[PDB]
Amino acid sequence: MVDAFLGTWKLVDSKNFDDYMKSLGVGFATRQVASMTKPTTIIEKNGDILTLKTHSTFKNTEISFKLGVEFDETTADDRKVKSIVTLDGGKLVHLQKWDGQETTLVRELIDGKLILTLTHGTAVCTRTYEKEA
């Protein structure tokens, strides 16, 4: 079910990421670097466990999780959140909860590209990733 998401992906398009970061309270200087960074996302599976790495020149993250099982996460911007990832309509849906807030990170495969939609408050950011061979 998750296999078409697996592999190494590089950022090729971003829309409204500054809006998303600002909604989360990220400071100007961090927004400014993040607007010029092109991360690599690596998604791998070992049995039921998925590991999602995000690498860049500015910040790295790594999470491991089982679909449908809550996990603690410390985000790139240092939020301590309660997270869960599932599959819904073929999309990989990641929900983060903290301080009564929520944000969703939804990944959809369209014509072999990985589209990441980030929503917080009213802000909606769309980032497009293409697969590395």
Ligand X SMILES: CC/C=C\C/C=C\C/C=C\C/C=C\C/C=C\CCCC(=O)O
Q: Residue positions in the annotated binding site?
A: 127-129
User: From the CB of 133, what's the least distance to ligand X, in Å?
Assistant: 20
Dihedral sign, Cα of residue 20, residue 26, residue 28, residue 30: negative
CA pair distance 78, 55, nearest whole angstrom: 16
CA pair distance 107, 104, nearest whole angstrom: 10
> How many residues line the site for ligand X (CB under 6 A)?
20
Q: Which two tokens stand for residue 32?
A: 């400014």
Which residue ranges make up the annotated binding site for (9Z)-octadecenoate? Answer: 127-129
CA pair distance 46, 34, nearest whole angstrom: 30
Does position 56 bind ligand X by CB under 6 A? yes
Q: Which stretch binds ligand X (CB under 6 A): 1-9, 51-59, 63-71, 87-95?
A: 51-59
Q: Where are the alpha helices (DSSP H) in 1-133?
A: 17-23, 28-34
Does position 76 bind ligand X by CB under 6 A? yes
Beta carbons within 10 angstroms of residue 84's beta carbon: 17
Residue selected from 30, 119, 126, 128 as contacting ligand X according to rule CB under 6 A: 30
Q: Which stretch binds ligand X (CB under 6 A): 1-9, 42-50, 66-74, 75-83?
A: 75-83
Residues that bind ligand X (CB under 6 A): 11, 21, 24, 26, 30, 34, 37, 39, 41, 54, 56, 58-61, 75-77, 116, 127
